[PDB]
């Protein structure tokens, strides 16, 4: 049978395509057989494919969970059984999992946000009139927002306009961003906490006319943010790495399954695509 085993949310989006790849490849290069299971968001099938491959003796399972309480007895079951599992991308609560690779979504609201200090500071003359699109019911957005922020007070002539809700919701994210627009005829910058509220962004600088005087940044790269850094008005995009994460995964099982010691925690950092390096992400849209 199978050596080791990733179970997946589904095959439709980048993301999880890209993880499958980092994986497959880091599994290929190191001699060992990993097949992977679709679960085409079914959370119920994540859990019964984790049973059918303890049952077949697999020697590690990688998995991206789509109910991170739900998949839970699952996991406890692979560790009864001797099994390590790695998480990936979803953060698990406490249990027997031997690791979680993911990102950190504070770290990753600063990294753009000193980005954005320092363009403020080469581009903008040193000033800038920001506004917020952010995500309130989101947890991981709501770290996005305050780790960009806390990057801010470096440069005490940034100050905030506003802050909208976008809901997480592209329509409810482009009607926010124009009212945050019309409202603020000085407002010169726009962060925007994930891709709903990136393509609202855009998509209200677009209905406003106002590409040539705001420039958005944001979090996940679409054709609409490419096409929006090629006009110059979406100046950086923050990206995740789930390759790099499918690869880390995968090594670490190989790790585990020699014996030796794996971190608790994984972090995979994320990149900053701007007009300079945004050509390498081109053939993937
Ligand atoms: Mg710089």
Same mark, same amino acid.
């Not at 020697?59 to 991206?64: Q, R």
């Not at 990936?88 to 990102?103: K, N, R, T, Y």
């Given at each position: 049978?199978?050596?080791?085993?990733?179970?997946?949310?589904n095959?439709?989006?980048?993301?999880?395509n890209?993880?499958?790849?980092?994986?497959?490849?880091?599994?290929?290069?190191?001699?060992?057989?990993?097949?992977?299971?679709?679960?085409?968001?079914?959370?119920?099938?994540?859990?019964?494919?984790?049973?059918?491959?303890?049952?077949?003796?697999?020697?590690?399972?990688?998995?991206?969970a789509?109910?991170?309480?739900?998949?839970?007895?699952?996991?406890?079951?692979?560790?009864?059984?001797?099994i390590?599992?790695?998480?990936?991308?979803?953060?698990?609560?406490?249990?027997?999992?031997?690791?979680?690779?993911?990102?950190?979504?504070?770290?990753?609201?600063?990294?753009?946000?000193?980005?954005?200090?320092?363009?403020?500071?080469?581009?903008?003359?040193?000033?800038?009139?920001?506004?917020?699109?952010?995500?309130?019911?989101?947890?991981?957005?709501?770290?996005?927002?305050?780790?960009?922020?806390?990057?801010?007070?470096?440069?005490?002539?940034?100050?905030?306009?506003?802050? $909208?809700?976008?809901?997480?919701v %592209? @329509?409810?994210?482009?009607?926010? +961003? !124009?009212? /945050?627009?019309?409202? *603020?005829?000085?407002?010169?910058?726009?962060?925007?906490?994930?891709?709903?509220?990136?393509?609202?962004?855009?998509?209200?600088?677009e209905?406003?006319?106002?590409?040539?005087?705001?420039?958005?940044?944001?979090?996940?790269?679409?054709?609409?943010?490419?096409?929006?850094?090629?006009?110059?008005? $979406?100046?950086?995009?923050?990206? %995740? @790495?789930?390759?790099?994460?499918? +690869? !880390?995964? /995968?090594?670490?099982? *190989?790790?585990?399954?020699?014996?030796?010691?794996?971190?608790?925690?994984?972090?995979?950092?994320?990149?900053?695509?701007?007009?300079?390096?945004?050509?390498?992400?081109?053939?993937?849209?």
């Amino acid at each position: 049978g199978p050596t080791y085993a990733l179970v997946q949310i589904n095959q439709q989006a980048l993301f999880f395509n890209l993880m499958n790849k980092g994986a497959q490849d880091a599994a290929k290069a190191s001699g060992k057989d990993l097949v992977i299971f679709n679960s085409n968001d079914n959370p119920v099938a994540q859990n019964d494919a984790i049973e059918n491959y303890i049952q077949q003796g697999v020697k590690g399972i990688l998995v991206a969970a789509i109910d991170v309480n739900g998949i839970m007895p699952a996991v406890k079951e692979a560790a009864a059984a001797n099994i390590p599992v790695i998480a990936i991308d979803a953060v698990l609560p406490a249990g027997p999992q031997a690791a979680q690779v993911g990102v950190d979504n504070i770290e990753g609201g600063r990294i753009i946000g000193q980005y954005f200090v320092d363009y403020v500071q080469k581009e903008m003359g040193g000033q800038a009139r920001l506004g917020i699109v952010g995500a309130l019911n989101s947890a991981i957005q709501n770290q996005r927002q305050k780790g960009f922020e806390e990057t801010l007070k470096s440069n005490p002539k940034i100050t905030i306009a506003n802050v $909208v809700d976008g809901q997480n919701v %592209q @329509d409810k994210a482009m009607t926010a +961003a !124009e009212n /945050l627009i019309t409202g *603020n005829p000085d407002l010169t910058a726009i962060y925007a906490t994930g891709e709903p509220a990136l393509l609202g962004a855009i998509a209200a600088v677009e209905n406003q006319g106002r590409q040539k005087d705001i420039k958005v940044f944001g979090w996940d790269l679409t054709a609409k943010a490419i096409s929006g850094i090629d006009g110059g008005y $979406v100046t950086a995009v923050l990206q %995740q @790495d789930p390759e790099k994460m499918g +690869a !880390e995964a /995968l090594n670490a099982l *190989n790790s585990i399954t020699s014996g030796k010691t794996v971190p608790k925690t994984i972090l995979v950092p994320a990149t900053v695509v701007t007009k300079a390096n945004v050509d390498s992400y081109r053939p993937l849209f």
